[PDB]
Paper text:
The D388N mutant was used to determine a Michaelis complex structure of EcOpgD because this mutant displayed the lowest activity among mutants of acidic amino acids conserved in its homologs, and this residue is located in the long cleft of the ligand-free structure. The complex structure was obtained as a dimer by co-crystallizing the D388N mutant with β-1,2-glucan. The substrate binding site is formed as a cleft in the ligand-free structure, whereas this site forms a tunnel in the structure of the complex. In EcOpgD, the seventh and eleventh Glc moieties from the reducing end of Sop13 form skew boat (1S3 and 1S5, respectively) conformations, according to the puckering coordinate system of a six-membered pyranose ring, Cremer–Pople parameters. A water molecule (Wat1) is located near the anomeric carbon of the seventh Glc moiety from the reducing end (3.5 Å). The angle formed by this water, the anomeric carbon and the glycosidic bond oxygen atom is 168.17°, which is close to 180° and suitable for the nucleophilic (in-line) attack of the anomeric carbon. The other Glc moiety with the skew boat conformation has no nucleophilic water because the O5 atom of the twelfth Glc moiety from the reducing end occupies the position for a nucleophile. These observations strongly suggest that the position of the seventh Glc moiety is subsite –1 and that EcOpgD accommodates a Sop13 molecule at subsites –7 to +6 as a Michaelis complex. D388 was identified as a general acid catalyst candidate because this acidic amino acid directly interacts with the oxygen atom of the glycosidic bond between subsites –1 and +1. No acidic residue directly interacting with the nucleophilic water is found in the complex structure, unlike canonical anomer inverting GH enzymes. Overall, a nucleophilic water is likely activated by D300 as a general base through the two water molecules (Wat2 and Wat3) and one substrate hydroxy group.
Residue numbers in the entry:
A (entry chain B): 42 to 150, 155 to 548
B (entry chain A): 43 to 150, 155 to 548
The structure:
Amino acid sequence: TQRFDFSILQSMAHDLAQTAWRGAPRPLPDTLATMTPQAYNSIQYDAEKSLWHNVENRQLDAQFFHMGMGFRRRVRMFSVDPATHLAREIHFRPELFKYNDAGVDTKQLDLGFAGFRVFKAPELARRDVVSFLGASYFRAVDDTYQYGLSARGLAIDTYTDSKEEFPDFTAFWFDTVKPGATTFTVYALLDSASITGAYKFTIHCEKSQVIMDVENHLYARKDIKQLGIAPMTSMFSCGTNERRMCDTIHPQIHDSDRLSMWRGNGEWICRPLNNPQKLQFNAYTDNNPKGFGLLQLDRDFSHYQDIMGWYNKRPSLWVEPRNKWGKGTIGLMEIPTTGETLNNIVCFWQPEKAVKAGDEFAFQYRLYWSAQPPVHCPLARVMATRTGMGGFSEGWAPGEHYPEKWARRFAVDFVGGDLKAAAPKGIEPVITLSSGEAKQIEILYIEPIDGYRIQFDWYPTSDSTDPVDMRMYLRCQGDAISETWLYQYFPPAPDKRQYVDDR
Amino acid sequence: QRFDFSILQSMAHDLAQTAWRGAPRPLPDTLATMTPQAYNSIQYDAEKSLWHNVENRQLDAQFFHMGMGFRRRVRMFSVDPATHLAREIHFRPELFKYNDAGVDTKQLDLGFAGFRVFKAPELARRDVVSFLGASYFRAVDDTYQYGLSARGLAIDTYTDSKEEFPDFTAFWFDTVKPGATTFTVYALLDSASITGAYKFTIHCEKSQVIMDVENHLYARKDIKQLGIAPMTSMFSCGTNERRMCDTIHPQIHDSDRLSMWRGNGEWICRPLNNPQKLQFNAYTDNNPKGFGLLQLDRDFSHYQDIMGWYNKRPSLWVEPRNKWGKGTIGLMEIPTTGETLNNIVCFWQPEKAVKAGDEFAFQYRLYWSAQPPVHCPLARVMATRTGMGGFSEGWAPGEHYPEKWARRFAVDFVGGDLKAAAPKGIEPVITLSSGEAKQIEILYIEPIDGYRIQFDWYPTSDSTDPVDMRMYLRCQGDAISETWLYQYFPPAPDKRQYVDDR
Ligand SMILES: OC[C@H]1O[C@@H](O[C@H]2[C@H](O[C@H]3[C@H](O[C@H]4[C@H](O[C@H]5[C@H](O[C@H]6[C@H](O[C@H]7[C@H](O[C@H]8[C@H](O[C@H]9[C@H](O[C@H]%10[C@H](O[C@H]%11[C@H](O[C@H]%12[C@H](O[C@@H]%13[C@@H](O)[C@H](O)[C@@H](CO)O[C@H]%13O)O[C@H](CO)[C@@H](O)[C@@H]%12O)O[C@H](CO)[C@@H](O)[C@@H]%11O)O[C@H](CO)[C@@H](O)[C@@H]%10O)O[C@H](CO)[C@@H](O)[C@@H]9O)O[C@H](CO)[C@@H](O)[C@@H]8O)O[C@H](CO)[C@@H](O)[C@@H]7O)O[C@H](CO)[C@@H](O)[C@@H]6O)O[C@H](CO)[C@@H](O)[C@@H]5O)O[C@H](CO)[C@@H](O)[C@@H]4O)O[C@H](CO)[C@@H](O)[C@@H]3O)O[C@H](CO)[C@@H](O)[C@@H]2O)[C@H](O)[C@@H](O)[C@@H]1O
Ligand SMILES: OC[C@H]1O[C@@H](O[C@H]2[C@H](O[C@H]3[C@H](O[C@H]4[C@H](O[C@H]5[C@H](O[C@H]6[C@H](O[C@H]7[C@H](O[C@H]8[C@H](O[C@H]9[C@H](O[C@H]%10[C@H](O[C@@H]%11[C@@H](O)[C@H](O)[C@@H](CO)O[C@H]%11O)O[C@H](CO)[C@@H](O)[C@@H]%10O)O[C@H](CO)[C@@H](O)[C@@H]9O)O[C@H](CO)[C@@H](O)[C@@H]8O)O[C@H](CO)[C@@H](O)[C@@H]7O)O[C@H](CO)[C@@H](O)[C@@H]6O)O[C@H](CO)[C@@H](O)[C@@H]5O)O[C@H](CO)[C@@H](O)[C@@H]4O)O[C@H](CO)[C@@H](O)[C@@H]3O)O[C@H](CO)[C@@H](O)[C@@H]2O)[C@H](O)[C@@H](O)[C@@H]1O
């Protein structure tokens, strides 16, 4: 046993920061390194040796992950008696696992735990609802039980003139779960070349969501180009907007469709996610952000047709800062993807002030894992962003030839708020553009969602292929009556603003 | 003045002994250059409606003005069916407003171009039946949204010479009874190669329009291709081979499939294509029971069209009223970039070569409704999906494209006896004209309580010839689904790869 609490973990992290980084894990055995995802996920932990097996009337239990594939960090695991503030280490032993000890090619296999996952009544040994695995990455599910997007303890150099640094959770301490409890507490040591951290997660496993109360203290070993707080990681391959990568049986493929920001000044932003041809970074200035999230608001199975991944059942993630974070940017990185496996969306909070060796930080935030975020704009909300050819009347698209003029059609569909009561008074879109002009601007009632479509044709004013930034909110009798739609469009090359008639 | 169906047949017979009157005179500029918007703004005088005088009428009729490509003078006659006496309704300028100034304001001899019928409570708007253009007509069910068309007749739609479009040159309307939602219109069909006498008994029912059609046809000339009970639709973008899908609309089509109930009782589901190159298929049959172009995806969210409402557009079912013998269901698919080209043609072509002097009589019923009146009692195709293969579902590589080129097919089945069949073993029976079906899976789809058949098509030949495919489900020795019939267009060999543009 040893003395353990959050204060001791902070000293540990602080003291670790004054010693040289332990460095990258040793390479795995080849049987583990070359192991397929299907083989990796078939590894069987001995349910009789579950972390909380000895707790009467337990509503939660926990098991560990084996090292394998890219998961090569030994993670040290401890049980904490919260009454006595005493931690005991749980030692890896091979007998805890089956189907871990032969490779893809049957070749027979020091090792350790790679992470943990938590199960809930009524299924204490299957269908885990929280999981920590790989670097500082974790995920949770809601009542659909379907895993989608990830969070991380921290992001470092995700978008800068040098390679991303991935911090690792190197140790977790589990408070022994109480009888009847659907909340558990886990402490984590974060360790990286640039930075150490002490984390406390108080994790609420509710009927329809997981709520994590996160507290961290960070201690910078080195100058850092980019510090990303409360990082989220998702994937967008094909949605309703700029469908360049949609050649599958699935009308849409994504773990999230949008970035949602509740700003320091009280403004709501809806930023539809892109799968761009070229790597893209955006930084959104804010001061005391109230919340931000990567949201999956299209719940319609018929929009995905995925009976393996169930994208339509995947959760939203909402970050709620528990203090004033001051000046900084919401960073959004969008990687070009051809499919599903690449985590091509990253979002984080980057404080304004440049990070120096010896800097300390303390952040508190709540994570909400659920179909809907816990808060949304009370005004009209963007339901979907659609793009395609413009330069013709809806209902009368020419079949005999392509449109004579090149333009890109935008349809932004709004629902909820006070659209019903406002419509008779007159609803106007307020559209600003970094380039081009919005023509044939229409405000059209959409009976099947009881909503309004703002449709316009973007005509280029420049041959430039620079990203085109767009903002739109609805006004009525001198008030904003919708959240702000913020879009980034990639116009084609000049010689591609025309149609090849291949028939 | 004396008129009945016997007299119409003598007229069409005698017409056929004379040379074709030829194509209509060109229109004045005012009318020739109208946009659809300007043409659809032409206003008929509702006070001069055809049955304005009929007490408690549940139907009324108005006429169309000439305009755009609607150049044929169509003569219109009122028939008292009680007395068999007909009087011509003469065209007058006074019957129309917004007909006499062009899109460029230029100020406007002429006739009627067609007719439309209105149903209580909207006797002057939102028409449910319309005859306009050549021998074309449409009807709507209880959505009241227009979609696909039918024609009286098709000639040379797909041959080594230009299509010939027969025209309806005259219509005779039985005066409607009070309370009746059925009307009778007779039509004279006139074309270079052929004349006809048509009788339509048109039932404007609560949820559908049913048309009892009888014709008598008289061939002036040899005919390379006679098309009986032709239908005409549009398929731009669906779930299958999505080459023309660059709009805000996940799908655009008036129909998604050809459904055939064959003489031997087989049900075929043939998903429609928007091919890169003009395509024709002839489906051999003998005494066909029914065939139709169906719009079975009714989900607004799958089209997002708040102008055309594709999801509200009707299916059209042809039910022969006799044994039609040997022949083919013709299907032509024209490449389209949009909505306005009627890129889908379907008709019955009798086996026997048509000769100058030949006469024919066909009886068929037309059902205009969301669903056809009959469907396969076994499992049915809900949808046909295509995309990249060569990877596992849920694990499509994002770091790179699949290493191997294959086309993935997903055929979703619903209904019949799948529930009871499932624990006994469902097997797909797949046949291909070329290539190989691999990673064949049968998968439960909880949300539609149905089964997906998924397979990856790997090519065996450099050929870019069309690849024909068939699939039906079998369980313990029995067919338990309709027959899926697909035509696939493999890319050129040096396009059987993915360019990594990022
Ligand atoms: O009994 C009961 C039951 O059972 C059953 O059975 C079944 C089962 O069930 C179960 C389940 O659950 C489970 C889960 O599962 C799930 C899955 O998952 C999976 C995953 O997936 C996913 C993914 O994601 C993930 C990840 O991964 C990834 C990676 O990542 C990484 C990172 O990355 C990063 C990056 O980095 C990179 C780089 O990149 C670069 C960059 O950087 C730059 O910028 C650029 C410029 O351009 O470039 C690029 O490229 O690179 C490099 C190379 O060089 C590398 O190295 C690196 O890495 O970056 C970026 C930026 O920043 C970012 O963003 C990213 O992130 O990184 C890190 C560090 O290093 C690491 O750590 C990581 O990992 O990546 C890779 C590459 O790229 C890729 O590929 C991958 O993918 O991972 C993470 C961590 O861990 C996580 O968080 C995530 O999530 O993907 C996607 C998206 O994208 C998504 O969506 C997915 O989801 O994956 C993994 C691996 O593989 C594994 O582990 C797993 O498993 O999935 C599926 C599909 O989707 C689903 O469905 C599921 O669900 O899992 C969990 C754990 O996690 C567990 O716990 C559970 O359990 O399911 C269900 C429902 O929910 C449940 O309930 C159950 O439980 O399942 C299975 C499947 O699995 C099957 O098999 C079976 O069957 C039965 O059936 C029944 O009956 C019963 O009842
Ligand atoms: O419901 C609710 C509401 O609404 C309304 O109502 C109303 C209505 O309205 C509606 C609208 O409608 C409109 C329409 O639309 C539609 C369309 O369709 C139609 C058509 O049109 C077309 C045309 O047609 C024609 C034909 O054609 C044919 C072809 O032929 C041609 C050629 O082609 C060629 C071929 O042949 C070959 O094979 C190839 C080789 O590759 O090539 C190609 O190219 O060409 C030539 C030149 O060069 C020419 O000439 C010819 O023509 O063929 C094919 C094959 O066979 C076939 O298929 C086709 O069909 O032809 C004939 C003979 O001549 C004629 O007659 C006709 O016309 O065409 C054109 C060109 O392309 C186009 O553009 C167009 O579009 O028409 C017909 C007759 O009339 C009919 O039936 C139909 O329908 O389209 C689409 C499809 O695609 C659809 O969807 C639509 O719908 O249009 C019209 C014109 O413009 C007008 O008038 C109308 O109005 O629509 C809208 C949108 O969608 C909707 O929404 C609505 O609804 O209407 C009615 C009437 O009809 C009335 O009554 C009503 O009222 C309102 O508002 C209310 O009321 C309601 O409630």
